[PDB]
C-alpha cells in the first residue's frame, strides 16, 4: 500500500532529534573519551621521562 | 615510578659529589707532602754545598 501523508511531519521530527544529539549528547562523550587517551598518553610519556 | 626515579637519581648524585670532594682532599694531602719533602731536601742540600 502507498498513500502520501505525514511526509513533512517525519522530516521535521528528524531534524529535532539530530540537533539535540549534536548539542547535548555528542560533545560530553567525546571529551570523556579523549581524557582516557590523554591520561594514558601522559602515563606512557612520564614512564619514558623517568628512564630518560 | 617517576618520584622513585628522581629520589634514586638525586641520592646517587649526592654520593658522586661527596666522593669527588674526598678525592680532591686526598690530592691536597699528597701535594702538601711533596712540597714538604722538597723543602726539607733543599735544607740538607744547602748544608752540603756550604760544607763543600
PDB file of C-alpha atoms in Angstrom:
ATOM      1  CA  UNK A   1       0.000   0.000   0.000  1.00  0.00           C
ATOM      2  CA  UNK A   2       1.181   3.569  -0.776  1.00  0.00           C
ATOM      3  CA  UNK A   3      -0.634   6.837   0.183  1.00  0.00           C
ATOM      4  CA  UNK A   4       1.287  10.136   0.595  1.00  0.00           C
ATOM      5  CA  UNK A   5       0.631  11.592   4.098  1.00  0.00           C
ATOM      6  CA  UNK A   6       2.824  12.516   7.191  1.00  0.00           C
ATOM      7  CA  UNK A   7       5.939  13.162   4.986  1.00  0.00           C
ATOM      8  CA  UNK A   8       6.589  16.722   6.307  1.00  0.00           C
ATOM      9  CA  UNK A   9       5.917  15.576   9.939  1.00  0.00           C
ATOM     10  CA  UNK A  10       8.661  12.881   9.952  1.00  0.00           C
ATOM     11  CA  UNK A  11      11.055  15.264   8.060  1.00  0.00           C
ATOM     12  CA  UNK A  12      10.772  17.941  10.823  1.00  0.00           C
ATOM     13  CA  UNK A  13      10.904  15.333  13.666  1.00  0.00           C
ATOM     14  CA  UNK A  14      14.254  14.005  12.322  1.00  0.00           C
ATOM     15  CA  UNK A  15      15.973  17.448  12.406  1.00  0.00           C
ATOM     16  CA  UNK A  16      14.843  17.928  16.060  1.00  0.00           C
ATOM     17  CA  UNK A  17      16.494  14.662  17.213  1.00  0.00           C
ATOM     18  CA  UNK A  18      19.671  15.360  15.124  1.00  0.00           C
ATOM     19  CA  UNK A  19      20.299  18.891  16.514  1.00  0.00           C
ATOM     20  CA  UNK A  20      19.503  17.760  20.124  1.00  0.00           C
ATOM     21  CA  UNK A  21      22.145  14.984  19.847  1.00  0.00           C
ATOM     22  CA  UNK A  22      24.651  17.440  18.255  1.00  0.00           C
ATOM     23  CA  UNK A  23      24.318  19.976  21.145  1.00  0.00           C
ATOM     24  CA  UNK A  24      23.686  17.824  24.273  1.00  0.00           C
ATOM     25  CA  UNK A  25      24.785  14.154  23.681  1.00  0.00           C
ATOM     26  CA  UNK A  26      27.813  14.250  21.341  1.00  0.00           C
ATOM     27  CA  UNK A  27      30.322  16.807  22.886  1.00  0.00           C
ATOM     28  CA  UNK A  28      30.466  15.463  26.533  1.00  0.00           C
ATOM     29  CA  UNK A  29      31.001  11.831  25.384  1.00  0.00           C
ATOM     30  CA  UNK A  30      33.961  12.762  23.105  1.00  0.00           C
ATOM     31  CA  UNK A  31      35.516  14.888  25.916  1.00  0.00           C
ATOM     32  CA  UNK A  32      35.293  11.920  28.353  1.00  0.00           C
ATOM     33  CA  UNK A  33      36.698   9.571  25.623  1.00  0.00           C
ATOM     34  CA  UNK A  34      39.681  11.922  24.957  1.00  0.00           C
ATOM     35  CA  UNK A  35      40.507  12.263  28.710  1.00  0.00           C
ATOM     36  CA  UNK A  36      41.290   8.485  28.997  1.00  0.00           C
ATOM     37  CA  UNK A  37      43.557   8.696  25.907  1.00  0.00           C
ATOM     38  CA  UNK A  38      45.280  11.871  27.296  1.00  0.00           C
ATOM     39  CA  UNK A  39      45.768  10.262  30.773  1.00  0.00           C
ATOM     40  CA  UNK A  40      47.241   7.072  29.213  1.00  0.00           C
ATOM     41  CA  UNK A  41      49.433   9.168  26.834  1.00  0.00           C
ATOM     42  CA  UNK A  42      50.741  11.208  29.830  1.00  0.00           C
ATOM     43  CA  UNK A  43      51.368   7.923  31.759  1.00  0.00           C
ATOM     44  CA  UNK A  44      53.382   6.262  28.927  1.00  0.00           C
ATOM     45  CA  UNK A  45      55.263   9.545  28.250  1.00  0.00           C
ATOM     46  CA  UNK A  46      56.022  10.009  32.008  1.00  0.00           C
ATOM     47  CA  UNK A  47      57.399   6.413  32.145  1.00  0.00           C
ATOM     48  CA  UNK A  48      59.740   7.317  29.223  1.00  0.00           C
ATOM     49  CA  UNK A  49      60.793  10.597  31.018  1.00  0.00           C
ATOM     50  CA  UNK A  50      61.650   8.581  34.166  1.00  0.00           C
ATOM     51  CA  UNK A  51      64.072   6.326  32.187  1.00  0.00           C
ATOM     52  CA  UNK A  52      65.458   9.341  30.187  1.00  0.00           C
TER      53      UNK A  52
ATOM     54  CA  UNK B   1      57.828   5.375  39.259  1.00  0.00           C
ATOM     55  CA  UNK B   2      58.728   8.999  38.344  1.00  0.00           C
ATOM     56  CA  UNK B   3      59.104  10.020  42.039  1.00  0.00           C
ATOM     57  CA  UNK B   4      61.217   6.890  42.865  1.00  0.00           C
ATOM     58  CA  UNK B   5      63.420   7.579  39.797  1.00  0.00           C
ATOM     59  CA  UNK B   6      64.063  11.197  40.990  1.00  0.00           C
ATOM     60  CA  UNK B   7      64.835  10.028  44.579  1.00  0.00           C
ATOM     61  CA  UNK B   8      67.369   7.367  43.401  1.00  0.00           C
ATOM     62  CA  UNK B   9      68.861   9.757  40.782  1.00  0.00           C
ATOM     63  CA  UNK B  10      69.268  12.585  43.351  1.00  0.00           C
ATOM     64  CA  UNK B  11      70.663  10.264  46.092  1.00  0.00           C
ATOM     65  CA  UNK B  12      73.366   8.714  43.815  1.00  0.00           C
ATOM     66  CA  UNK B  13      74.374  12.226  42.580  1.00  0.00           C
ATOM     67  CA  UNK B  14      74.957  13.177  46.304  1.00  0.00           C
ATOM     68  CA  UNK B  15      77.352  10.190  46.631  1.00  0.00           C
ATOM     69  CA  UNK B  16      79.212  11.265  43.432  1.00  0.00           C
ATOM     70  CA  UNK B  17      79.687  14.918  44.608  1.00  0.00           C
ATOM     71  CA  UNK B  18      80.717  13.730  48.110  1.00  0.00           C
ATOM     72  CA  UNK B  19      83.240  11.270  46.559  1.00  0.00           C
ATOM     73  CA  UNK B  20      84.589  13.996  44.195  1.00  0.00           C
ATOM     74  CA  UNK B  21      85.372  16.308  47.146  1.00  0.00           C
ATOM     75  CA  UNK B  22      87.043  13.412  49.077  1.00  0.00           C
ATOM     76  CA  UNK B  23      89.278  12.633  46.016  1.00  0.00           C
ATOM     77  CA  UNK B  24      90.421  16.299  45.841  1.00  0.00           C
ATOM     78  CA  UNK B  25      91.226  16.448  49.606  1.00  0.00           C
ATOM     79  CA  UNK B  26      93.485  13.350  49.273  1.00  0.00           C
ATOM     80  CA  UNK B  27      95.233  15.090  46.321  1.00  0.00           C
ATOM     81  CA  UNK B  28      95.814  18.173  48.595  1.00  0.00           C
ATOM     82  CA  UNK B  29      97.401  15.878  51.297  1.00  0.00           C
ATOM     83  CA  UNK B  30      99.730  14.407  48.599  1.00  0.00           C
ATOM     84  CA  UNK B  31     100.525  17.920  47.270  1.00  0.00           C
ATOM     85  CA  UNK B  32     101.471  19.149  50.779  1.00  0.00           C
ATOM     86  CA  UNK B  33     103.685  16.046  51.334  1.00  0.00           C
ATOM     87  CA  UNK B  34     105.680  16.510  48.083  1.00  0.00           C
ATOM     88  CA  UNK B  35     106.438  20.231  48.802  1.00  0.00           C
ATOM     89  CA  UNK B  36     107.308  19.430  52.483  1.00  0.00           C
ATOM     90  CA  UNK B  37     109.798  16.727  51.370  1.00  0.00           C
ATOM     91  CA  UNK B  38     111.285  19.168  48.810  1.00  0.00           C
ATOM     92  CA  UNK B  39     111.610  21.972  51.429  1.00  0.00           C
ATOM     93  CA  UNK B  40     113.474  19.601  53.812  1.00  0.00           C
ATOM     94  CA  UNK B  41     115.593  18.182  50.919  1.00  0.00           C
ATOM     95  CA  UNK B  42     116.600  21.752  49.900  1.00  0.00           C
ATOM     96  CA  UNK B  43     117.615  22.430  53.556  1.00  0.00           C
ATOM     97  CA  UNK B  44     120.020  19.408  53.566  1.00  0.00           C
ATOM     98  CA  UNK B  45     121.384  20.281  50.068  1.00  0.00           C
ATOM     99  CA  UNK B  46     122.279  23.889  51.044  1.00  0.00           C
ATOM    100  CA  UNK B  47     124.090  22.439  54.116  1.00  0.00           C
ATOM    101  CA  UNK B  48     126.129  20.143  51.760  1.00  0.00           C
ATOM    102  CA  UNK B  49     127.170  22.999  49.413  1.00  0.00           C
ATOM    103  CA  UNK B  50     128.256  25.266  52.349  1.00  0.00           C
ATOM    104  CA  UNK B  51     130.384  22.470  53.903  1.00  0.00           C
ATOM    105  CA  UNK B  52     131.933  21.757  50.457  1.00  0.00           C
TER     106      UNK B  52
END
